[PDB]
Amino acid sequence: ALHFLDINATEVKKYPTAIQDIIINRSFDGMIIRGVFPRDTMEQVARCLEEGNDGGMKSILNKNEEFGTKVAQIYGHAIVGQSPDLKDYFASSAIFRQACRTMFQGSPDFEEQVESIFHSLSGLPVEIPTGPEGQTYTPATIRLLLEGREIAVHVGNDFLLMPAANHLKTLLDLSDQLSYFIPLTVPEAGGELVVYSLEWNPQEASKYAQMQEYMDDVEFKIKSNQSQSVAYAPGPGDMLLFNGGRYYHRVSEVIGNSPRRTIGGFLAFSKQRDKIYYWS
Ligand SMILES: O=C(O)CCC(=O)C(=O)O
Ligand code: NI
Ligand code: NI
């Protein structure tokens, strides 16, 4: 039984240590924050991507056609799965920030609005990380889930076991990371975030020679219903902020001809717990 708060965006200042409460005190596990962006803004950014006047976002669309036709497509390289040099990731991330800033037209700016939310919920400065030579990480990527596609079950803290995380681990507290995302467009059915009470467990994972074999077993656990779940279908402009680092989660298959498009990533404390970093 994971515990999520449902508040409005005008209420964030009433929860000034929410992020500390989720990560450090562990007194609840996530929150939905309604209307972080206006619906008009979501519809505007959506039309930019549909029509192709997207500031170049289309140039960093990764269709993932080598992962099968059941996988999400993504604008921008996600850091998960990147090689530890991060060269291609840093390039896509610069393109992403410019395209994103173009599409949002400051009405409101994506980075500014997301940073304001995280600040209100922590009382701390908020920053996008920079690489060892000053390269910018991306604040977010955009996931595009067409009809019949899903995001398979996974857990966020596995990032801390990947070579892509090497540099980020020098800046981070190494406690749980949170997930955050905001729908731009929502599908007619499906496309639901499901979060399970099954937790990240590197101890169990180390008994497997191939992580794929370990995930095949996680899939059996969650499909046996042994684990409790909660499920959410935020609307356009609502933000979902949750302990995806600790808890396995997935997004259910999209149904119908309207794609699910979501913008988001992750956040976590700095080494000394005196700043919020956020990235994708
Ligand atoms: O639906 C999305 O854009 C991402 C879902 C997810 O896996 C996360 O927020 O960590
Ligand atoms: Ni995730
Ligand atoms: Ni539904």
Side-chain angles (χ1 to χ4, degrees), residues 1-43 45-69 71-86 88-203 205-206 208-211 214-220 222 224-225 227 229-280:
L2 290 183
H3 181 202
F4 278 46
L5 306 188
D6 193 344
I7 67 170
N8 185 263
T10 66
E11 296 192 284
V12 294
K13 282 189 157 218
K14 290 153 53 160
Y15 301 87
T17 55
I19 296 174
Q20 291 86 343
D21 283 346
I22 297 171
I23 292 171
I24 301 168
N25 308 327
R26 311 291 326 291
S27 51
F28 57 99
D29 305 306
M31 47 193 306
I32 187 162
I33 308 173
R34 308 296 186 170
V36 169
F37 294 89
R39 298 279 300 245
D40 294 321
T41 301
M42 303 293 86
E43 289 161 19
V45 180
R47 280 199 308 283
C48 288
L49 301 165
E50 292 164 12
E51 304 182 349
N53 65 312
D54 59 7
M57 195 59 86
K58 71 177 79 62
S59 73
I60 49 167
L61 175 62
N62 299 287
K63 301 193 188 197
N64 291 329
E65 278 168 357
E66 81 284 335
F67 286 114
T69 325
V71 178
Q73 309 186 359
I74 182 165
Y75 295 93
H77 290 304
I79 193 155
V80 160
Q82 291 295 304
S83 311
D85 63 286
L86 293 181
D88 294 324
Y89 169 84
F90 287 138
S92 69
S93 297
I95 287 152
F96 186 96
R97 287 190 73 193
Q98 165 70 22
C100 196
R101 192 179 299 124
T102 293
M103 281 186 288
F104 276 78
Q105 300 186 313
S107 306
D109 182 66
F110 172 76
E111 288 175 17
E112 296 189 343
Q113 187 74 350
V114 166
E115 286 171 18
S116 173
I117 296 290
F118 297 160
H119 176 71
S120 292
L121 296 175
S122 70
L124 298 174
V126 185
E127 293 182 359
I128 305 165
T130 65
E133 290 76 39
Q135 310 94 317
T136 190
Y137 284 63
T138 193
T141 47
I142 298 166
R143 275 75 65 175
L144 168 68
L145 278 180
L146 306 177
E147 176 171 11
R149 314 302 188 84
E150 59 186 303
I151 301 176
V153 67
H154 65 283
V155 71
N157 282 0
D158 276 348
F159 174 64
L160 293 179
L161 307 166
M162 294 174 191
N166 283 345
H167 173 258
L168 252 186
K169 293 159 87 174
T170 65
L171 304 174
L172 296 184
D173 182 43
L174 303 191
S175 46
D176 292 329
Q177 65 171 55
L178 309 185
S179 286
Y180 86 93
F181 72 83
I182 298 110
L184 303 166
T185 62
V186 290
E188 299 154 51
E192 298 128 331
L193 181 78
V194 189
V195 191
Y196 302 92
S197 56
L198 193 68
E199 299 183 25
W200 186 59
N201 201 343
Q203 172 174 7
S206 63
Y208 290 83
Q210 298 292 13
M211 277 298 286
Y214 171 62
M215 304 156 174
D216 290 16
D217 175 81
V218 163
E219 296 199 321
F220 159 57
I222 72 164
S224 66
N225 305 331
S227 192
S229 59
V230 297
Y232 293 100
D238 300 342
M239 175 190 290
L240 204 60
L241 171 60
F242 67 106
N243 200 345
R246 177 178 291 268
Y247 298 110
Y248 281 89
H249 56 283
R250 69 183 187 96
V251 178
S252 68
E253 180 175 329
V254 169
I255 299 171
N257 313 124
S258 301
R260 185 182 180 268
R261 297 177 187 83
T262 43
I263 183 168
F266 319 98
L267 64 161
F269 285 102
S270 71
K271 281 275 174 225
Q272 296 201 270
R273 285 170 171 176
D274 61 352
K275 179 193 318 183
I276 303 305
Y277 283 117
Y278 77 110
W279 72 95
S280 187

